[PDB]
């Protein structure tokens, strides 16, 4: 739990948008990631501070299909320690993953989702979505944005669920290539 513990403290923040409470992973410097349906926009609340969003990029694939990820550049002096090195180069499943959740309503919470498998296509609330992975755990509302970790790796971001299963958007280190 050392990794998940250090990642929560250094990198994972309680967040609010117009869509409600979400978990947010700071990736490096002022770059952070959120589930697309959180619709950050121009501003978000990070730990009850109203922050300006300088940039928001919604990840889609070459065909323009939703990946349910939104990269945000925050207007803050605070820098996140670089965790891109814990993000695998290709979207990979895992064994015994821990879903890390951190919102005002569900603070500092570890969820034993278990195995994480390649899933692919998912119709998330009527929206076609690609590159998703799945875990057989009854995830619930308010857990979106949750960080899926396994053996020192950050493999996904929780985005949805169907009652008995949880889904995350796969994480590639390539998403975070510098400019």
């Amino acid at each position: 739990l050392d990794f998940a513990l250090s990642l929560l403290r250094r990198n994972i923040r309680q967040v609010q948008t117009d869509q409600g409470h979400f978990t947010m992973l700071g990736v490096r410097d002022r770059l952070a990631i959120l589930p697309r349906h959180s619709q950050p926009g121009k501003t978000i609340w990070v730990e009850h501070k109203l922050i300006n969003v300088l940039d928001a990029v919604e990840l889609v694939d070459e065909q323009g299909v939703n990946l349910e990820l939104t990269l945000v550049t925050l207007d803050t002096n605070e820098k996140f320690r670089d965790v891109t090195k814990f993000i695998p180069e290709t979207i990979t499943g895992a064994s015994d993953a821990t879903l890390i959740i951190n919102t005002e309503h569900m603070p500092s919470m570890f969820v034993p989702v278990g195995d994480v498998v390649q899933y692919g296509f998912l119709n998330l609330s009527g929206k076609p979505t690609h590159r998703t992975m799945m875990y057989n755990f009854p995830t619930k509302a308010g857990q979106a944005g949750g960080v899926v970790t396994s053996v020192g790796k950050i493999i996904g971001i929780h985005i949805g669920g169907n009652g008995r299963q949880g889904f995350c958007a796969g994480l590639k280190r390539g998403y975070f290539a510098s400019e």
């Binding site: 296509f121 998330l124 619930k140 308010g142 979106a144 949805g160 949880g166």
Partner: peptide
């Protein structure tokens, strides 16, 4: 009715 889920 497969491959379905809702945002959470």
């Amino acid at each position: 009715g497969l491959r379905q889920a809702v945002t959470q």
